[PDB]
């Protein structure tokens with residue numbers, strides 16, 4: 001008992017949160033998808049008693065604004081009441097929190113470093129004080145913005161290096177970034193959850209140091225939605241039951257690295 | 259801008275969040291206190307424009323239910339509308355969220371291990387595998403409850419160890435637990451924020467492994483308070499500005515180790 005009607009869930013394809021399910025025969029509706037977020041959605045529907053319809057965000061975007069303030073992506077779907085929930089790795093940010101509501105986080109993470117295994121680099125500071133190893137982030141991504149705006153000595157220094165080499169230092173997309181780490185002596189600054197995913201599948205790669213910032217993913221709802229607080233309670237129940245840990249293990253685990 | 263009235267803030271003495279100021283001259287009102295949470299209040303009032311009056315919770319408790327299902331501590335002060343905000347390291351929990359509201363976390367942490375430096379022990383699994391090194395937690399503490407309830411094989415084994423060896427493994431209080439780590443061959447399971455604090459000030463001690471669970475501290479409010487969402491937004495602003503990082507450094511950092 002949450003509402004007498006199917007809830008519309010906006011989402012986006014992103015491994016391993018929301019993925020297209022491999023099948024030998026055609027699949028329909030929600031059955032077409034799988035992943036951490038689909039498991040979270042099933043768990044939330046079990047606890048809260050709702051039926052749902054998963055719809056990919058038409059423009060394939062998470063949510064940002066133009067200079068006139070027009071939002072796009074999942075955030076816009078919620079603002080316009082075209083979706084009841086957004087279940088995706090959607091970062092809880094100051095700007096978004098002003099236009100939509102978020103449950104409390106289901107996952108906490110931060111910016112960290114993706115690099116090769118067995119080198120003497122152990123931190124952002126180590127990278128900052130040298131020039132032989134290149135480093136950067138996805139151009140105009142969440143990680144790039146963090147460095148551009150930072151007033152922290154080491155991060156301001158890193159940004160100076162990342163913006164001297166517009167082209168060599170920054171990457172066009174995340175695919176290019178991972179390819180660059182694998183093919184050149186390059187360290188990629190990126191979301192720690194994605195680092196964990198990649199390092200479980202590439203034994204030659206490792207995370208360097210800890211978290212550079214702190215952020216979390218939350219279920220998005222339109223502003224004022226009564227479902228927001230019920231989803232927060234369900235997330236807390238899942239955490240205390242150990243189910244958030246089991247869901248992360250399920251999707252993140254690789255078959256092993258020596 | 260936020261409220262016409264001076265907000266009543268319930269809090270509790272807990273180093274380095276809320277402490278009594280050491281002065282040689284009498285201190286009055288809010289000037290009697292200092293700490294991470296007093297700095298957080300200053301920053302939140304600077305953003306939101308409210309005035310506040312800090313009051314230590316009479317019973318000196320965070321908030322739990324007794325046998326009659328009656329709440330105590332800061333939680334009870336909020337329930338009864340004797341406080342507008344609770345600004346303290348108050349864990350966001352499923353039970354509390356049922357009776358009060360919380361801002362999104364201003365600090366994330368988890369259970370971890372405090373032990374002596376330079377040993378071969380590197381994780382909970384290393385401790386679980388043996389019996390020579392005793393390990394445990396504060397009796398009926400948050401940390402003990404986690405182990406008692408866990409379905410994770412490693413932690414279920416650790417609970418079996420703790421419950422069977424209760425007289426030595428389970429400690430009466432935090433002080434007793436820290437003395438055990440210092441005087442005996444004992445590892446203490448406890449909140450990671452408190453481990454960081456202790457290890458910055460005692461070079462003989464270290465944190466073992468990473469985080470065993472995930473939890474956050476939030477600003478508590480009575481259910482329905484309009485200040486809750488404003489607080490959440492101010493917390494997001496402070497993190498993005500790097501002020502939460504600066505505040506954590508200010509109060510946690512020690513003078514170093516060899």
Ligand SMILES: O=C(O)[C@@H]1C[C@H]2C[C@@H](Oc3cccc(Cl)c3-c3nnn[nH]3)CC[C@H]2CN1
Pocket residue numbers: 014062063089090091092137138141142143174177189190191194
């Ligand atoms: O709310 C948001 O905008 C993001 C959208 C989305 C962004 C995804 O970004 C990556 C995804 C995979 C691999 C990498 Cl290498 C990155 C990355 N990008 N910037 N820094 N690292 C991370 C997961 C999601 C987290 N919420």
Ligand SMILES: O=C(O)[C@@H]1C[C@H]2C[C@@H](Oc3cccc(Cl)c3-c3nnn[nH]3)CC[C@H]2CN1
Pocket residue numbers: 272320321347348349350396399400401432435447448449452
């Ligand atoms: O909302 C709550 O009830 C708690 C209450 C309070 C608990 C404090 O816990 C410790 C603090 C310092 C040292 C230690 Cl050793 C402990 C601890 N860890 N496990 N058992 N005891 C941490 C601060 C607050 C965290 N929120």
